[PDB]
Structures are given as C-alpha cells and as structure tokens.
Design a protein around this ligand. Structure first.
Ligand SMILES: [Mg+2]
Ligand SMILES: [Mg+2]
Ligand SMILES: [Mg+2]
Ligand SMILES: [Mg+2]
Ligand SMILES: [Mg+2]
Ligand SMILES: [Mg+2]
Ligand SMILES: [Mg+2]
Lengths: 76, 139, 185, 141
C-alpha cells in the first residue's frame, strides 16, 4: 500500500513491504564566479543531483551560474 | 565586454546542449552555442554521430568562428560491423568485422585529415583502429 | 653454433687448489680415452652459458691435439651455487644420444586468453650422428587452448634423428594462470 | 594451507639442521627461482604468506611452483605447564629448508615482474634469500 509519513525516519514500513521512496530533491541555483564550477560540480556529484543548464550572467566574467536538483539531506 | 580567445575543445555530433564545457570558456564568448547543431549537424548528417573536434575563437565585439573536422575511426567502423560498443576485451574477443576493402572505403572518408596522402598508409591506422576495439579484419 | 675452449691436462693436483686459482676440474672420456683435464672458470662459464650441452665445445688441448667434445654433465656445488667439475664426452661417429634444444615456434591460443605456456622440455633426447646437430628444433604451439597438452609424438624430427624417449612423453602445456579472483576461497 | 592429507606417526623428533640441500638445488620448472641461504624450518603459513604475496602481485597471470612442502609436525606444550608429563601436541607444520634450496618458481611473467614478486615473497620468509634465473647449468642437471 501507499504511505505518507513520518518525519523521523526510523519507523517506515519494512522492506518486506516497500517498493517506493522520496527524497525531496530540490535543484538550486548557485551563482558563482569564474570557475569554482569544477570543484563545485563534483561536490554535487557526491550529493548527487541533477543539472538542467542555467547560464553565465555577463561579466564580471567570473560571473556564472548552475541549476541543480539534489536531495534535501545530501544538499544540506 | 570580455577579451578575445583561442579555445581548444573536443565536442560530439548531435548531442548539442549548453551543458559544459560548452561554457566555462564559451561564456567568455557569449557563444552562439546553438549555431553548432545547425551548421554542423547539417553537413554532418552524412557521417551520423561521433566526436568531431572544434576550435572556436571569440573577438572584440563578442562573436565566434570555427571549422571542424571528421568523426573517429571508432565510429565509421562501429556501423560497419553492427556494433554500438566495441568488445569489452579486445585482441581475443571478436564481435563484428571488416574486409580489406571495407577498411579501404573508410580511409576514403577520413583522408582530408591525418598526414599521409596514401591509401596504403592511411587505412593501416584504420586497420590499427581494428584491434584497438577487437574487430577482426578478414583475410 | 659450435665453440672452442682451451683445456689443459692435469695430474695429481689438488682439486680444491685448482679451484682456488679460478680453474675448474674436469675429465674427458669415451669408449677409448679417459684423461684428467682442467679448464679456466671464466673461459668455460662464457662458453658454457652459450654452449650448454647441446652443441660442440672443441678443446684446445696443450699440444695441438684439438678435440670435439660434448658436455655430458656439470657437477654443481649445491650450496653456493657454482659449478664444481665438468665432464667432456669425446665424439666419434657412431650416433650419440644427446640433447637438442626446442623452439616453441608461435604464440598459443591459451595466452590470447590469459594462459601460461608451460614448456615442460626445453630440449629433447635423440640418437643422431655428430654430422647432423640440428641446433634448434621447432614446434607448432600456435594452435593451443588452455588445458592443451603436446607430446613428443608430434614433433617434426629432421634428418634423421631418432627420438630417444618414448613418444607418449609430454613436452608442452598451456595452463590456467593464477587469479586473485580465485584464491579468496 | 599445506599439510600432509594423512600420515603414519602423529608427532616426530626434531632432528638437526646440518648440511646443504639434499635435492632441488636447481631451478627446474619456471624461469625464476627464490633460493635459500640459511637453514631453518619454514612454516606452512609462511609458505602461504609468500605464495599469496606473489599472486596478489601478478594479479591474474603466471604460474607459481612451490617446491618445499611442509611435512614435519611441529609440537608444542600448553602454556604454563611444567616440564615432562609427555610430548607436546601438534601445532602446525614446517618444512626443513637448507641453503641452496629452490623454494618457489614463477613462470610466464616479465623479468621485471618476477623479481618484484620473488622479492616480496622473500620478505615473508624467516631466512635469507637470493633470486635467480634458470641458468643453463640447471638444464644440464
Ligand atoms: Mg663465475
Ligand atoms: Mg617457529
Ligand atoms: Mg617443537
Ligand atoms: Mg613440544
Ligand atoms: Mg617433556
Ligand atoms: Mg627474509
Ligand atoms: Mg638426478
């Protein structure tokens, strides 16, 4: 059966019965400059997320951006 | 108002999304980044796919320029043996193949490139592209 | 192919004392002769590392009596791993049992998987006349999977040149080649 | 780890470690041997410690020929027990190794590779060692 809750995780129904789950993955926009992107991106490879695209804002050239979907826990 | 360029990349054919590294220096461009999929996948809807390199250069008033090349010897052979992926473990594991002419007709496709104006020299490298993925050449 | 080495005769000299002065005891022999001889170590080492017991070391005896010999056996100091004393068989003309090297011509199919070509014999035994010393002898290893065995009964055989050892004798195998993936069991 | 699948006598007298080897003083299977310089008792688990380090090192490839086998039981008394009262009880196996003994032999491996395997293996061992390459003397034997 389907099931909504609970905020404090331990409870949730046994893997005997459990075929679905949800990590309220947001994707976030980070302005950054220049490249911190290499460092950053990989970081967002551990706390796994999802690139859409985004854009360079104009310069300062170190002007730049990134829109990523990552699960709430990993993100924090 | 960003300075001129001399960009050195290596981008594939078809998959043309603004996703990097079509950006980290191609934003130092204001790069007309969708000009790729049009001007490039028009002449190169004749090969099919594969990484065709690109040397783009920006200038003063924020615009670009490039003249690309040709798709891998690991592509033109993959279609001529019914292969997507190579063979996992080359040298011993053969999946599909290519004849002495099917290797010659490929040098035909990538000749305005390398260095040798030979068909005897060029296809060797193509014949060298053979074992590299495990595709056998019929004697 | 065939070599030359400068033997000197020896009498009652104490073996250990020859040895002391870099010289190596020996004795040459056949149906007819049998004479106490010595040879220089370094001279013989070079010659032997090259010649082994397959070819023909010719002996520069100290009287122009030059002799054509084959090394029948070298006796080693078991401990500090040096040779101690050679034997020299003098060749005649009746065919002589001796050892001819093997050439495993080709790379097997077993390697070309990961295997190991285990060369059981790096030489064979045949009665042949001293005229015809086929200093190599080759084999078709090229057609070899893993779990593949080759026996002397194949084997080309020159002119001609009789297998001393019974044809069922095994000379070659390709074998599984370790694996850390094994082991952990 | 190696040990006689079965035997006749459970324990056996220690003996003495005198002389040089009685046999197997020459490389006779592979292309590269490890040879022994001091005499000692090499213990079932050392041989294994040494084999493994080479396999782990070759990782896939080569053959390993191990030419000592441990068939001498090695006895011990329980801790804190007193003298006498009987002979100890078997606690493992050594093989008896005496200088000039070819212990291991690797094959189908690059010279670079072998001598780094046979070298590590020799660190596992309780004695002093020398690596060697199937001469020609060893073919004359
Ligand atoms: Mg010497
Ligand atoms: Mg002990
Ligand atoms: Mg004891
Ligand atoms: Mg005891
Ligand atoms: Mg007692
Ligand atoms: Mg040691
Ligand atoms: Mg014997």
């Amino acid at each position: 059966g389907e099931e909504v809750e609970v905020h404090n995780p331990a409870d949730l129904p046994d893997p005997t019965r459990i075929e679905e789950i949800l990590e309220p993955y947001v994707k976030l926009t980070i302005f950054t400059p220049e490249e911190y992107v290499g460092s950053l991106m990989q970081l967002l490879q551990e706390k796994r997320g999802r690139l859409v695209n985004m854009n360079y804002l104009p310069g300062a050239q170190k002007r730049v951006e990134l829109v990523y979907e990552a699960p709430f826990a990993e993100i924090l | 108002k960003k300075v001129v360029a001399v960009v050195k990349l290596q981008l594939p054919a078809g998959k043309a999304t603004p996703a990097p590294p079509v950006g980290p220096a191609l934003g130092q461009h204001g790069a007309n980044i969708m000009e790729f999929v049009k001007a490039f996948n028009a002449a190169t809807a004749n090969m099919g796919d594969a990484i065709v390199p690109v040397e783009i250069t920006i200038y003063a008033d924020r615009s670009f320029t490039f003249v690309t090349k040709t798709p891998p010897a690991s592509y033109l052979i993959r279609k001529a043996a019914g292969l997507e992926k190579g063979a996992h473990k080359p040298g011993r594991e053969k999946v599909g193949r290519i004849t002495w002419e099917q290797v010659l007709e490929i040098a035909k496709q990538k000749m305005p490139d390398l260095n040798t104006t030979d068909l005897e020299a060029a296809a060797r490298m193509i014949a060298g592209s053979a074992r590299s993925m495990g595709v056998e050449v019929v004697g | 192919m065939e070599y030359r080495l400068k033997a000197y005769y020896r009498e009652g000299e104490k073996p250990s004392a020859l040895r002391r002065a870099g010289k190596l005891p020996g004795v040459m022999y056949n149906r007819h002769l049998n004479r106490k001889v010595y040879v220089d170590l370094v001279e013989f080492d070079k010659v032997f590392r090259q010649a082994s017991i397959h070819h023909v070391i010719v002996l520069e005896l100290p009287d122009g009596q030059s002799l054509p010999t084959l090394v029948r056996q070298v006796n080693l100091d078991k401990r500090r791993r040096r040779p101690e004393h050679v034997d020299f068989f003098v060749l005649s003309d009746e065919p002589v049992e001796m050892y001819v090297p093997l050439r495993f011509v080709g790379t097997p199919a077993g390697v070309r998987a990961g295997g190991v070509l285990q060369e059981i014999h790096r030489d064979i035994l045949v009665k042949v006349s001293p005229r015809n010393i086929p200093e190599f002898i080759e084999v078709d290893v090229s057609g070899l999977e893993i779990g593949d065995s080759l026996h002397a009964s194949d084997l080309k055989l020159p002119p001609g040149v009789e297998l001393a050892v019974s044809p069922e004798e095994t000379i070659a195998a390709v074998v599984p080649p370790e694996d850390v993936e094994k082991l952990a069991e | 780890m190696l040990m006689p699948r079965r035997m006749k006598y459970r324990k056996q007298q220690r003996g003495r470690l005198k002389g040089a080897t009685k046999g197997g003083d020459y490389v006779a299977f592979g292309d590269y041997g490890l040879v022994a310089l001091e005499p000692a008792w090499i213990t079932a688990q050392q041989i294994e410690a040494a084999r493994v380090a080479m396999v782990r090192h070759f990782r896939r490839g080569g053959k390993i020929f191990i030419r000592i086998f441990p068939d001498k039981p090695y006895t011990k008394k329980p801790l804190e027990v007193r003298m006498g009262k009987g002979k100890g009880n078997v606690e493992g196996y050594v093989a008896v190794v005496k200088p000039g003994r070819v212990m291991f032999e690797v094959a189908g491996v690059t010279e670079e590779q072998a001598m780094e395997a046979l070298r590590i293996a020799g660190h596992k061992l309780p004695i002093k060692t020398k690596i060697v390459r199937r001469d020609a003397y060893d073919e004359a034997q």
